[PDB]
Amino acid sequence: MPIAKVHRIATASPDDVSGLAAAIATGAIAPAGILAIFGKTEGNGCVNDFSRGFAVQSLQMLLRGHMGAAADEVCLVMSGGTEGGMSPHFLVFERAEPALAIGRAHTPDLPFEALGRMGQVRMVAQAVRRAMAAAGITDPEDVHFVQVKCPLLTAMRVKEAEARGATTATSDTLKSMGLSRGASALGIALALGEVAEDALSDAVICADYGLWSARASCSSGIELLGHEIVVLGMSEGWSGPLAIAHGVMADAIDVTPVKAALSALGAEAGEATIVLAKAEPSRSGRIRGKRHTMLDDSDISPTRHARAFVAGALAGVVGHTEIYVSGGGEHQGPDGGGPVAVIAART
Amino acid sequence: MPIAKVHRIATASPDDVSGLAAAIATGAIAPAGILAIFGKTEGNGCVNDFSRGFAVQSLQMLLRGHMGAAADEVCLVMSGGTEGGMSPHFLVFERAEGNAPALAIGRAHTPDLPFEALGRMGQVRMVAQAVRRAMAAAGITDPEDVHFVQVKCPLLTAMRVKEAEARGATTATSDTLKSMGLSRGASALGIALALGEVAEDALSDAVICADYGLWSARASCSSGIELLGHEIVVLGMSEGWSGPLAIAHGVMADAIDVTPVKAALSALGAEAGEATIVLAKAEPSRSGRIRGKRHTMLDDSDISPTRHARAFVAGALAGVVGHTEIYVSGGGEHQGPDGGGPVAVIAARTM
Amino acid sequence: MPIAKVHRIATASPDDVSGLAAAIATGAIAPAGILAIFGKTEGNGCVNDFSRGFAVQSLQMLLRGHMGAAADEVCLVMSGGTEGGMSPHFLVFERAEGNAPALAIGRAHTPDLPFEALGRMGQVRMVAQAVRRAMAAAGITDPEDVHFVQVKCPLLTAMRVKEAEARGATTATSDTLKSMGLSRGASALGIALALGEVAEDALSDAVICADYGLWSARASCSSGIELLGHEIVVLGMSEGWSGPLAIAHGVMADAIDVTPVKAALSALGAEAGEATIVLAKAEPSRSGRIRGKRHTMLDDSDISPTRHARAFVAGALAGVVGHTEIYVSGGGEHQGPDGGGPVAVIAARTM
Amino acid sequence: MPIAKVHRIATASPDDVSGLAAAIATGAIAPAGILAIFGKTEGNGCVNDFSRGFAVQSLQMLLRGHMGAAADEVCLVMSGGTEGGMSPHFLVFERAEPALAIGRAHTPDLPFEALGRMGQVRMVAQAVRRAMAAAGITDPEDVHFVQVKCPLLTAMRVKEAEARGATTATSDTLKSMGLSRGASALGIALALGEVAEDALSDAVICADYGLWSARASCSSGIELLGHEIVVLGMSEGWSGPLAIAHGVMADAIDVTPVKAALSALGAEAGEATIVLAKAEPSRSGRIRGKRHTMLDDSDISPTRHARAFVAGALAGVVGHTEIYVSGGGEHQGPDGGGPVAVIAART
Ligand SMILES: O=C1CC(=O)NC(=O)N1
Ligand SMILES: O=C1CC(=O)NC(=O)N1
Ligand SMILES: O=C1CC(=O)NC(=O)N1
Ligand SMILES: O=C1CC(=O)NC(=O)N1
Ligand SMILES: O=C1CC(=O)NC(=O)N1
Ligand SMILES: O=C1CC(=O)NC(=O)N1
Ligand SMILES: [Mg+2]
Ligand SMILES: [Mg+2]
Ligand SMILES: [Mg+2]
Ligand SMILES: [Mg+2]
Ligand SMILES: [Mg+2]
Ligand SMILES: [Mg+2]
């Protein structure tokens, strides 16, 4: 009889762990039961975003203090970029004593020449199986959202790779984020059976954006070399007030999937609603026939636009700004769209 | 009896006037009756945004071709900044002649604005006078029949500040991005003053962009490097106009308050669709919070605050109205409450 | 016997042609003899830079006024991006008639470039042919007498890529900022091919923006959203020209290699001063290092790499030549070694 | 007979302390003798720059490891913004057993309503006296460079201030950096006798840019609430190979002061040369008559331009890119200019 408990904690700063410390001090959260922490941090959400790594170090110090080496098994998904009115926050996932289930998993360092290729797809497919097992889930149809934290390439990482005779899938550092999210997304797809294995090859990745998962949510970062996996789903072997529902946004302003999730969860939009969504600029250069400018803008990187825009669209529906919106939906939902999940209690 | 005709035209480029050319060529739009053109252009919407001036020049060239010197009387409001999915377009406002109350349109211009008047009572009075003129031209005497007042106002660059100081004057600021806020703010109070939403002996230099408790529910101001004076366009309802188009408006309490638009669409007897026309002001709240939750728009040295506000509010409204060809403008100094802004809708009745 | 006249004109705005107007009005510049105009405009110098197109339109309007349809034969190279202290200006190249070897100028144009040719041998051959034509027009047959070849080339936007795919074609990229590099690169190889710095059977699609060991010491390419073809301007020395102006050039080994300019000024018998004219390419090095030390230009999602390179190299050169009215252009694909770029100086002899 | 030793350490990352660890491991640097560390970090060098605070935490952990609570007396000046080719690095100042002298000092937290006012000017003037004493310097004419790390204001910090009835000198967060650097600069000026005390008042600060120090170098940051002071100068009571010279750059491309410093130091430009310089966009909007665009640019903040530009100008002279250039020279050198210092050995 395990219990899922999800806690949304405000932050004033990437290094501001004061509020999580407080939930531990008041015994609202028990350090021993922390599975994973998601975050929105104030960085640019792209390559040179050190708010991500900054938060990670700060969370590491605090969690090790309370659980020493067992902190290292906690999944830290720090997703940068809080544009528009999107409010920075931590999402703490704690395990307690059918309802919401949580499973986690890790991977070894990822060879720079494996990134964006079938190497990454595999190595991630496995972790998703392990973590969805640890969640106590056997039916893929009972999975609702799979978060992945993946690596990326810098110019210096690229030249290091070439120095030992290897080639990387790109030398463009920002493209390398897309490849990593995409390859990871297909790995998630593979493990949930949304894609056939012989449908995949290096040439397919970030090319056939017709292959996609309705549940992949992948976030790239400069601060890790392997992967973090967190599976959220519904299970018979879990109990508690919290359930999760999900849907696919067809484009950047498609908010009906969220209204549908709330219905399924039997909850109404309010400050209490937890929202996880992927935002992506559509590669057509259009939304519902109308041209957009995100792919042609040299000042503000495309994912910064997408986040700002869908965060606004979603906040207009759910009524508050503490929502988790993540940019770049390579093979995560249809092109121009992305998965969205809601976590609420029944009324 | 005159008819308002409002035309939304796509553009691929700030200088793409091809769709306006075609509308004129097919007689969909008669150049003689063009009162004003609004635009969202692909620039950054701040100080060094030349997509605005580029569109103006392009529009001026086309219109001089058809109207000659009368082209100069057309109000050109080019508001830059199309962040998020917001889609670049022109809004052409035409007056035509036809046979209940309908959309009315009035325009007015002003002389150049002395750099030392910007952000001060000089600007306020100048715009106020112009707004009264445009009101009259719309055939509107009751301010409650005014629904939206668009103003294009100037700003300060380093060069302009030093020009002013060179002749013994001071400007209200030397921060060029701040000058855009002051200029929008002074213009907004001018609109307020003209509509009677604010009392004249309540206003002074010291109040402007200081007492954000003074605001208009109808002001919409957009600053730009490309003009030295103001363009004023008043939109309202009038008994002396007819046609299918009406206008409704409301005030967003904050950046995610989408209820004013749904209420506006009800008043108009219309439902959200590709055809809905939306004009809205988006503003980062100076409290640094939205509904208790902190935001980072005022603290970001990479992306200028209005750039955030626009992308964010455009997304909220687009989510409601179902398309991205909407006019959203950043910085709501004295335009609605702090953190909010006016929103207006223009639709035809279907119920 | 023809004379090169080079005029450096300040601008307050991309659309500020006032100084060029005055130079024409005072007969300092005769419109008939205007061969090309270079510009540094206040845009970001990347994909969505409309200061370039804005200056072009403005220049086209003024020149059509004086020359009519012959205006269209003037090469307009507007290079955006004036970071750091770099000062926005126009460089007007005029041919005049006078009575040793001196500055020679040649221009040439090309037809529109098929989107599926950009970054591929199509573009390379197109530019190569044009550079040969401009060479001839300059009255230059010896390539060693060519000192600098400026090329304005197109780029790809999302819309253009989807247009190409719609008719069964592929483009060499879908990354619009990458398309600028490919276009500069293909053009540079075209210049190289035309000057014999590279062999034709060394070139192929697979080489372009891949083998940065193939490069020209004289190529200078600038990409822009505002044209579909190319503008070519060849600068060199010729026996068949006379006048005070000569040109010298060199290759910066990296971003802080200022020795080529000092050597160039020696060759020209001139010393650094307000009058020195400088044209240079700046490029972030793909090794990610300068002289062993890492740089962050390739890793920055806020500021695009060429934006860095320009500001940085402009500072180095400005520190040498003593003023900030210099023409610095970013992205040196096949223009000099990786991390370097050509620099040319134009001066009159005083020793 | 104290010895000044200055060590320039490369970094791949704001949190990359591997190279400083190595100098400690090889005994090239002794943790006990570390006085202050200067840094160039990859952030935007402005308000939301977390690479600064990120480095600080990383340096804190490493230094506390070796010297515990005595690490806290080490001055950490992390200056963000590495535009152009400027290469991120640490400058470690260690004390060993007339030549280069080093003195340090601290200040308490700074009240948000004191920032940019005579409060800050004073509180900093004192620390500069204390630190220049600890350096063993009595003649102000023997001081060559005074580094200050100062605080700034965020929107949330502003509303916190107003909540208790106080007003701040600004509500513009980026302006608050200028006020803090300026007020600190005048404080340094005050202590070196470059300015008279009754010449100062709130109204003068960041207004009369005719009052300035030839030695102030002030750097603002979101990650501290008080001030860090480091004085560098020439002393009889110090010995060793290292000397320091300084000069004032009249504008952004005035490189002759550095050639002059090298002459005084009897060294020639080379990879070995250490450079400290302040860069500022001139408020005239011109450099030597020619208009510039730094004050009118809404995409890239003015100090980001200035750094890129003078870093390039200086690197062209000194031949390498590992130089410390800091943006914004309010009362630090003339308007449009800034102090520059060089540290070399005699040949
Ligand atoms: O939203 C996102 C997507 C990503 O890949 N990396 C981030 O830091 N944030
Ligand atoms: O409002 C203002 C006026 C000024 O001069 N400087 C500023 O920073 N803000
Ligand atoms: O949204 C806006 C507000 C403004 O003042 N100027 C613009 O160009 N766009
Ligand atoms: O060079 C290229 C071609 C492409 O399609 N996508 C990329 O990211 N880079
Ligand atoms: O510096 C440059 C290089 C380019 O390709 N295009 C520009 O507009 N400026
Ligand atoms: O160069 C600088 C000046 C400053 O105030 N703050 C920084 O982080 N860097
Ligand atoms: Mg998708
Ligand atoms: Mg349309
Ligand atoms: Mg408002
Ligand atoms: Mg001049
Ligand atoms: Mg090169
Ligand atoms: Mg100064």
Residue numbers in the entry:
A (entry chain B), D (entry chain B): 1 to 97, 105 to 354
B (entry chain A), C (entry chain A): 1 to 99, 104 to 355
What do the authors of the reporting publication say about this deposited model?
The first step of cyanuric acid metabolism is catalyzed by cyanuric acid hydrolase (CAH) and results in s-triazine ring opening to produce unstable carboxybiuret, which undergoes rapid, spontaneous decarboxylation to yield biuret. We have conducted X-ray crystallographic studies of the cyanuric acid hydrolase from Azorhizobium caulinodans ORS 571 (NCBI reference sequence; YP_001526808.1), denoted here as CAH. AtzD and CAH are 51% identical in a pairwise amino acid sequence alignment and share an overall unique fold consisting of three structurally analogous domains that form a barrel structure. The active site of CAH with the pseudo 3-fold rotational symmetry constructed from 3 structurally homologous domains seems optimal for catalyzing hydrolysis of the 3-fold symmetrical cyanuric acid.
